[PDB]
Amino acid sequence: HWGYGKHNGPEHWHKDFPIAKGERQSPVDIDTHTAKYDPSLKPLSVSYDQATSLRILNNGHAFNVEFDDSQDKAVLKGGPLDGTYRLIQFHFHWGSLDGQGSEHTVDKKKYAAELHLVHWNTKYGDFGKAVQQPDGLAVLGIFLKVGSAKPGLQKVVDVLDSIKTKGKSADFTNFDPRGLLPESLDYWTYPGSLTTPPLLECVTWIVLKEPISVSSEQVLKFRKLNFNGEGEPEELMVDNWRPAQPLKNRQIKASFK
Ligand SMILES: C[C@H]1OC(C)(C)O[C@H]1[C@H](O)CNCCCn1cc(CNc2ccc(S(N)(=O)=O)cc2)nn1
Numbered sequence: 215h216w217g218y219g220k221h222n223g224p225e226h227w228h229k230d231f232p233i234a235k236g237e238r239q240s241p242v243d244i245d246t247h248t249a250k251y252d253p254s255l256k257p258l259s260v261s262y263d264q265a266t267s268l269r270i271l272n273n274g275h276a277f278n279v280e281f282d283d284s285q286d287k288a289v290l291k292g293g294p295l296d297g298t299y300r301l302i303q304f305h306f307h308w309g310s311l312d313g314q315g316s317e318h319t320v321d322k323k324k325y326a327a328e329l330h331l332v333h334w335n336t337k338y339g340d341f342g343k344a345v346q347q348p349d350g351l352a353v354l355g356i357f358l359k360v361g362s363a364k365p366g367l368q369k370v371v372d373v374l375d376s377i378k379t380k381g382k383s384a385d386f387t388n389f390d391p392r393g394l395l396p397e398s399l400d401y402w403t404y405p406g407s408l409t410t411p412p413l414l415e416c417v418t419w420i421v422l423k424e425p426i427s428v429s430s431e432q433v434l435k436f437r438k439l440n441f442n443g444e445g446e447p448e449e450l451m452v453d454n455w456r457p458a459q460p461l462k463n464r465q466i467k468a469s470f471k
């Protein structure tokens with residue numbers, strides 16, 4: 215099965231998922247000098263006031279905080295998007311060291327981690343249908359740098375001990391994802407893909423320019439997770455990021471001058 219080891223990491227994925235070498239793969243390097251301001255982009259609308267978190271799951275690749283997406287309760291609209299995208303889950307990608315972990319890069323700079331808030335287009339009815347469409351998903355990506363603690367992350371950090379290994383879940387109600395956002399909603403956007411298998415080319419990427427700060431202690435707790443199941447050889451869940459893929463025939467647009 216695919217993963218992030220020497221024997222099953224990103225350079226192997228194309229053998230089971232040939233779209234890995236496709237025309238709109240993610241992540242990518244954001245060359246800030248080449249990205250063009252697009253004055254036609256609308257302001258982003260992040261409406262998370264009625265969000266209903268349910269559960270946190272270690273899926274063997276990351277941990278997902280899952281939401282009730284059976285109604286419009288936490289939605290993303292505006293910016294490059296047509297229509298209404300419902301929040302289904304968020305997760306992170308992170309490194310073994312502070313100098314790597316992000317999937318997207320900015321002028322080849324790697325951040326310590328990257329948050330993905332995953333949303334699906336309500337016109338397709340369910341997430342499984344939406345991932346089969348070129349405009350099915352919108353992923354809001356937020357960089358993490360190490361410095362001051364992020365208070366709104368601590369409830370996530372403190373439950374990780376209870377989902378150490380693959381397949382463990384825990385109740386995770388009443389979590390407010392607004393506490394993970396930076397001050398500014400300035401962004402870059404481009405058409406891309408899921409960054410893990412099945413690597414489907416279904417994503418409008420919206421990557422915020424302003425990183426959030428998390429503490430060294432917060433990211434150290436990420437790095438104590440395990441890719442393995444309980445009672446299997448311990449393999450730390452670190453370096454669960456895909457490197458930048460070729461931009462090909464794509465333009466990255468900026469929401470800001
Ligand atoms: C097995 C253990 O030992 C090693 C050192 C391999 O890693 C350990 C692992 O963590 C656990 N042992 C194996 C399980 C995980 N795995 C499988 C393989 C080789 N097959 C394989 C299949 C599909 C793809 S894909 N979908 O195209 O990306 C890539 C590689 N390599 N790892």
Ligand SMILES: C[C@H]1OC(C)(C)O[C@H]1[C@H](O)CNCCCn1cc(CNc2ccc(S(N)(=O)=O)cc2)nn1
Nearest residue numbers: 330331332341342345353407408409410411412417
């Ligand atoms: C449903 C599936 O059920 C089985 C396994 C039986 O076949 C599958 C079927 O073939 C298809 N059914 C599943 C849904 C399709 N899908 C989605 C996912 C993971 N989503 C995901 C979300 C965000 C990002 S990121 N990092 O933000 O870019 C990366 C990955 N994995 N699959």
Ligand SMILES: [Zn+2]
Nearest residue numbers: 305307330409
């Ligand atoms: Zn992701």
